[PDB]
């Protein structure tokens, strides 16, 4: 897409139609004449383009109305309404830009933001952009939260988010122009390498993969066209459905061997009958011939009843000989058919211990993607967010993804090493109680108009609670938290002195030995300038590898690497890091997944802000005071940096609309 219409696409918006959010702010235009809509729509579309072509300088209203042509630059309040709507909801002037109009001397309103995860930083930066007093509380001693990044000398490797999933309509595209981010592109080629240490051959490699994708589609067909979504009162998981598909494919292979052999016995048993008629005619023939030599032994001259006898036997025997000849005729066809039927026997197995293990690596792939055992994903809903995938190649950050949070953090009041222990929200306002992570005795209290909560879903899930809400979160919110899924997948970073892998392949698999260990070190990434290899621990293995010393984990990595490249090309690693996201108490996991029994609707419940009860009874219903952002709050883009960032942009705009007022709805 290109032109103004490309700006709309690069901003996740239809170019030819008004969104449900715009209908909210411009109800005067959605119900009005289609002419004004196309004006509006063009007026919006051009504005994004101007921001988009130059996202390092603030786009001011004036600059925008300058660069519009008539008739579009005639309604200056339309242009002002549009530009204000966009700026508010983070579609323009977000991220890191030079401000033309400097900050207002005095701020209005006070907001405490729990966490400087990217969602946090994103909102904080927007609220401050809106003239609000904003303080971020941080349990860690660094910003970025689940954007973690190892550094030692020239070694650099993310233990957290590592890939930009395409610039086609990605808000991280904007950020990338706004901050020196070296984005290196990922080469899709990935050789599998089973437990022995040698490549799986293309023939097999391609056919398991083909079956894998075929297997996935089948499951999709079970949930949507056969309604296979409940089973023993419980929701069907993607894992169950994959087994039910394989089983129905293993049953089909047998069902078609049975059919084959059954045809074979139908012929063999029909051939049997044929031979019976032939071994019975050869003895009517045996006896007739005897009778004929006897009748022909009577030398002539003979009376007619004896001449007729020889001729009659001669006729009768010929008849039988014709008859038996027409049956070794038929005894011939069937014999041919039998070599045909046997000659074309159908497949003996659906998949075998070889097949079934490369298939397990494609399941470890899924498990790593959703950071969870396929038994926990929702069959119906696990892929609900896939309509909104970005276009374009998948990318890495050669200087580490950290450089983005760090960039966002400049200019912001960040209290590091401050763990929130309790959040109290009332009609007159809120107060957050935090401690010092270093010395737990020191206690802090922050009073504010509203709290923006970017605590991880794993944190929110914790029992017993790491953060107390006063009053408690309502049931509808806390059941969304249970119902949802917060998965886990750790990494192992291997720093060497020299490159001993194929330097033009970025990533290569290792095929595990068991279904149970399909995730244990099943993928290595070569992404970085320095000699660093990065190993994934996914699926059921991720949870368990956390109860194992790094040394032991590195041993397994070294053993796997040695088999691939030989016991002597693989040196000792200079620097080693394996983390623990499920054990990290400021994460308690890696990212969210649509659990079985959840839906994407739960992601919407997570984002509804909380409005407390009135102080004095009979007082008018108050303002909402507790707001939620973060990866597990953006239904369409869960567990995926833009999604975090996008959710922080969302809350900032909706908090400002609340505490600063919307001067663009009139």
């Amino acid at each position: 897409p290109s032109g103004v219409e490309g700006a709309a696409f690069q901003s996740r918006l239809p170019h030819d139609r008004m969104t449900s959010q715009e209908a909210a702010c411009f109800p005067d235009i959605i119900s009005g004449p289609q002419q004004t809509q196309k004006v509006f729509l063009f007026i919006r579309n051009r504005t994004l383009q101007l921001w988009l072509d130059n996202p390092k300088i603030q786009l001011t209203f004036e600059a925008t109305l300058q660069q519009l042509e008539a008739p579009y630059n005639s309604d200056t309040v339309l242009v002002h309404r549009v530009h204000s709507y966009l700026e508010r909801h983070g579609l323009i002037n977000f991220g890191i830009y030079k401000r033309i109009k400097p900050l207002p001397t005095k701020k209005t309103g006070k907001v405490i933001i729990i966490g400087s995860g990217v969602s946090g930083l994103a909102a904080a930066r927007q609220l401050q952009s809106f003239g609000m007093d904003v303080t971020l509380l941080e349990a860690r001693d660094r910003v970025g939260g689940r954007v973690a990044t190892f550094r030692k000398g020239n070694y650099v490797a993310d233990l957290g988010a590592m890939v930009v999933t395409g610039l086609g309509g990605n808000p991280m595209a904007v950020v990338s122009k706004q901050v020196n981010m070296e984005l290196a592109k990922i080469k899709q080629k990935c050789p599998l390498y089973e437990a022995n240490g040698q490549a799986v051959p293309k023939e097999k490699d391609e056919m398991v993969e083909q079956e894998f994708n075929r297997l996935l589609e089948a499951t999709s067909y079970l949930s949507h066209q056969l309604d296979f979504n409940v089973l023993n009162n419980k929701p069907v998981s993607l894992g169950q459905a994959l087994e039910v598909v394989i089983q129905l494919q293993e049953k089909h292979v047998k069902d078609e061997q049975i059919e084959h052999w059954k045809k074979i016995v139908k012929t063999q048993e029909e051939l049997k009958e044929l031979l019976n008629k032939m071994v019975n005619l050869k003895e009517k023939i045996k006896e007739l011939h005897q009778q004929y030599k006897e009748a022909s032994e009577v030398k002539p001259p003979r009376d007619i009843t004896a001449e007729f006898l020889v001729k009659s036997k001669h006729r009768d025997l010929t008849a039988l000989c014709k008859e038996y000849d027409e049956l070794a005729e038929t005894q011939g066809k069937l014999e041919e058919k039998l070599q045909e039927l046997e000659a074309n026997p159908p497949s003996d197995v659906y998949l075998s211990s070889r097949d079934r293990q490369i298939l397990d690596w494609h399941f470890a792939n899924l498990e790593f993607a959703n950071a969870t055992p396929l038994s926990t994903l929702s069959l119906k809903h696990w892929d609900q967010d896939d309509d909104f995938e970005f276009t374009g190649s998948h990318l890495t950050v050669r200087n580490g993804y950290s450089c983005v949070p760090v960039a966002l953090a400049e200019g912001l009041d960040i209290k590091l090493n401050t763990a929130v222990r309790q959040v109290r929200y009332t009609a007159s306002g809120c107060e957050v109680i935090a401690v010092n992570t270093r010395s737990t005795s020191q206690t802090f209290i922050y009073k504010c108009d509203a709290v923006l909560c970017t605590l991880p879903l794993g944190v929110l899930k914790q029992q017993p609670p790491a953060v107390q809400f006063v009053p408690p979160l309502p049931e509808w919110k806390t059941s969304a938290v249970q119902r949802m899924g917060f998965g886990n997948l750790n990494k192992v970073v291997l720093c060497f002195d020299r490159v001993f892998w194929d330097p033009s392949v970025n990533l290569f698999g290792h095929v595990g030995s068991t279904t149970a260990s399909r995730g244990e070190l099943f993928l290595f990434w070569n992404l970085y300038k320095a000699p660093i290899l990065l190993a994934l621990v996914a699926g059921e293995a991720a949870g368990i590898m956390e109860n194992i010393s790094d040394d032991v984990i590195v041993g397994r990595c070294l053993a796997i690497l040695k088999g691939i490249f030989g016991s002597s090309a693989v040196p000792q690693p200079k620097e080693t890091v394996v983390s623990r996201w499920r054990a990290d108490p400021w994460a308690r996991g890696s990212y969210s997944y649509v659990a079985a029994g959840s839906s994407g609707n739960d992601y919407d419940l997570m984002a509804q802000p909380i409005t407390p009860g009135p102080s004095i009874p009979g007082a008018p219903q108050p303002i909402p005071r507790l707001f939620f952002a973060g990866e597990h709050t953006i239904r369409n883009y869960p567990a995926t940096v833009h999604g975090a960032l996008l959710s922080g942009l969302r809350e900032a705009g909706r908090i400002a609309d609340q505490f600063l007022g919307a001067m663009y709805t009139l």
Binding site: V163, Q188, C190, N365, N370, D385, L523
Partner: peptide, 9 residues
């Protein structure tokens, strides 16, 4: 998310 899938078809 399904978008993290490696070697996507």
């Amino acid at each position: 998310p399904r978008s993290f899938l490696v070697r996507k078809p």
